[PDB]
Structure 1
Amino acid sequence: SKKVNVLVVGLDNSGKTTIIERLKPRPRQAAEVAPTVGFTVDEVEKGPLTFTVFDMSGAGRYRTLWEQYYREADAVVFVVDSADKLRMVVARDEMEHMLKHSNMRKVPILYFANKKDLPVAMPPVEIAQALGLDDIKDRPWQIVPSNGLTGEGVDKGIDWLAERLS
């Protein structure tokens, strides 16, 4: 295989951890998921690729930790809780600081528009609007609506990401 570093970031409660569950074999996956504490390095297989998955907390307190992992990242997964219209700008700000950082190379970013199932969930296109994703023109990016409970979209997303890494 080939080993790659995948940073998973996003505001707290976007479903980074839950989405990361659906990447494990179905017997491995757990039922409820605890709010990530600090951060958790994990590992995941997908074809010719081995993903070392750094799952961060998105709580206020912990966002200052993401930068510890930019230097090594070979790709980034960015989770957005589609039903949290409120914090989109905060989501955006953190995203922007990430892109700014001198350590974060122009590696591919995959945005999951997560919780696609929720009643007030925002359309992928409105999300890409708030985040100003269309402005990103030096990296491959893609936005994929997703349900992290069911697993919907997740593979479609990871599959996309895998193309870029090959």
Structure 2
Amino acid sequence: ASKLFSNLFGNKEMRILMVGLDGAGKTTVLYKLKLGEVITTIPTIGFNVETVQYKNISFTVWDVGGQDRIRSLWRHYYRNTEGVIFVIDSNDRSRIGEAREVMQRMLNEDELRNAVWLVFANKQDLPEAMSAAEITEKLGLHSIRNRPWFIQSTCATSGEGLYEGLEWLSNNLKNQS
């Protein structure tokens, strides 16, 4: 319903996990992609998961936070993930430390070791927000080793940057059977 993601994604199977702190703009991203109905599943009371399935592309999304208590189920999703999209509210300096802590925990998860890392520096339409370079430094992305990563400036409201990021992801994502 969006445009040409059919040519991009083709018929390959990309299993994508999109997470980030609440308020980052993940749900906005899902709807803006216009790739399919956003499905809400609650595998466990209090744990809301949103999914979008487009041909062989799957997006699984949920909110994370500094005080998260990971559950076995989370790791079940992790094992089935080929690419991770971590969404950041570029205009929230008060929570960038929290995002860093959460993302660092994920970078150290055994079950996510092979996933390529795409960071969405979202809400870039706000001039007072942090730049992608600032976010790259704060998250410590340059210290990442043996794992492809990329940071993309985005505005989920307008959809700007979303294709560029998913393009990188599609070209770098490593398939796992």
* TM-score, normalising length: structure 2: 0.79
Equivalent pairs counted in the alignment come to 155
Q: Cα distance, 1:71 vs. partner?
A: 0.8
Matches of 1:90 and 1:59, distance apart in 2: 7
**Deviation string, structure 1 residues 91-145 (Cα, Å, up to 9, x no partner):** 0111011111121122211101000011321000000011000011211111011
Q: Distance in 2 between matches of 1:59 and 1:24?
A: 27
CA distance in 1, matches of 2:118, 2:21: 15
What percent identity do the matched residue pairs reach?
Answer: 38
Q: Are the counterparts in 2 of residues 112 and 146 from structure 1 also a CA contact under 8 Å?
A: yes
The alignment yields a C-alpha RMSD, in angstroms, of: 2.3
Residue 33 of structure 1 is matched in structure 2 by none
Please say if 1:11 is aligned against 2:17. Answer: no
Cα distance change of structure 1 residues 76 and 24 upon mapping to structure 2, 3 Å threshold = same
In the TM superposition, residue 61 of structure 1 has moved relative to its aligned partner by: 7.4
Distance in 2 (CA, whole Å) between partners of 1:12 and 1:103 is 23
Q: Where in structure 2 are the equivalents of 1:19-58 lying within 5 Å?
A: 19-25=29-35, 38-44=48-54, 50-58=56-64
Q: Answer yes or no: is 1:129 the counterpart of 2:122.
A: no
For 2:139 and 2:93, how far apart are their aligned partners in 1? 11
Q: Distance in 1 between matches of 2:124 and 2:77?
A: 28
- Identify the residue that residue 87 of structure 2 maps to in structure 1: 79
Aligned partner (choices 141, 162, 165) of residue 157 of structure 1: 165
Q: CA deviation at 1:20?
A: 1.7
**Alignment partner of 1:113 out of 107, 121, 127:** 121
CA contact (8 A) 1:41 1:53 kept: yes
TM-score by length of 1: 0.83
